[PDB]
Design a binder for this molecule. Structure first.
Ligand SMILES: Nc1ncnc2c1ncn2[C@@H]1O[C@H](COP(=O)(O)CP(=O)(O)OP(=O)(O)O)[C@@H](O)[C@H]1O
Lengths: 49, 56
DNA sequence: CAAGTACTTTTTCCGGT
RNA sequence: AGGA
DNA sequence: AGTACTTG
């Protein structure tokens, strides 16, 4: 069915940015602890809390 | 306070040496120390103390 | 005595010199 | 050095 | 950018 509205349709230059989900997604539930403080480590890389 | 804090106790005579959990050695490899800053400053105190003792 | 000085808490949570 |  | 503090 025809849309009751008319859409502003035309080409526009779009850039792909360095922020991709799978490079940001993180979950932790028990894992490495620091030594001094004996608290969770820091960073997605290090698998921190 | 005569029980918990007398003025004389603001002067240090005998110094408490905290244990490893406080100043852990970040022990890289199998043959490498990696001693804490507190562990080094404590040895400095010791050295400074030993000199004074013998000197007097 | 005052000016000009240092410190300080100076927004939060998420790649690697 | 970057992210909301 | 401010405040008690500090030093001239
Ligand atoms: N330095 C910072 N600290 C904390 N929160 C911040 C921040 N910078 C941005 N934000 C958060 O991110 C939100 C979005 O800010 P922006 O990303 O610049 C788009 P906007 O200013 O809200 O205008 P828009 O909705 O018309 O596009 C803010 O309202 C704020 O909660």
């Amino acid at each position: 069915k025809k849309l009751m509205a008319q859409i502003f349709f035309g080409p526009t230059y779009y850039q792909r940015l360095r922020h991709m989900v799978d490079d940001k997604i993180h979950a932790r539930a028990r894992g490495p602890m620091q030594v001094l403080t004996r608290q969770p480590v820091e960073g997605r890389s290090r698998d921190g809390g | 306070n005569e029980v918990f804090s007398r003025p004389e106790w603001m002067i240090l005579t005998c110094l408490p040496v905290p244990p490893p959990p406080v100043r852990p050695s970040i022990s890289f490899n199998e043959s490498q120390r990696g001693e804490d800053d507190l562990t080094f400053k404590l040895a400095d105190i010791l050295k400074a103390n030993i000199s004074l003792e013998t000197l007097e």
